[PDB]
Amino acid sequence: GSSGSSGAPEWTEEDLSQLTRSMVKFPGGTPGRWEKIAHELGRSVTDVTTKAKQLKDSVTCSPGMVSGPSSG
């Protein structure tokens, strides 16, 4: 179709707050994870994963969760 329209809308507290809820319903390894979270949030797979990935990248956790420098 020649005619075209805008793409996908930005992220809003609503969409940013819902994601956390969906992520729980569809954890990692699950078949169609992003495919399910998107249908729930109302966005496109890439649209979601592309957003979540940013959240997983910028986080606050130990620089290296290690057990010990030397056993023996």
Identify the H or E element spanning 35.
Answer: helix 33-41
At 16, the amino acid letter reads: L
- Closest to 14 measured CA to CA, from 36, 35, 43, 34: 43
Q: How far apart are CA 13 and CA 11, in angstroms?
A: 7
- Give whole-number Cα distances, 27 to 3, 23, 33, in Å: 38, 6, 7
Query: Determination method here?
Result: NMR
Annotation: CATH topology of 2-68:
Arc Repressor Mutant, subunit A (1.10.10)
Q: How many residues does the chain have?
A: 72
DSSP 9-39: ----HHHHHHHHHHHHHS-TT-TTHHHHHHH
Contacts of 29 (CB under 8 A, 6+ apart): none
- What are the domain boundaries of the chain? 2-68
When computed from its CA atoms, the radius of gyration of the chain, rounded to whole angstroms, is: 17
Q: Tokens for 36?
A: 């399910």
Q: How far apart are CA 29 and CA 67, in angstroms?
A: 26
Number of Cβ within 10 Å of residue 50's Cβ equals: 12
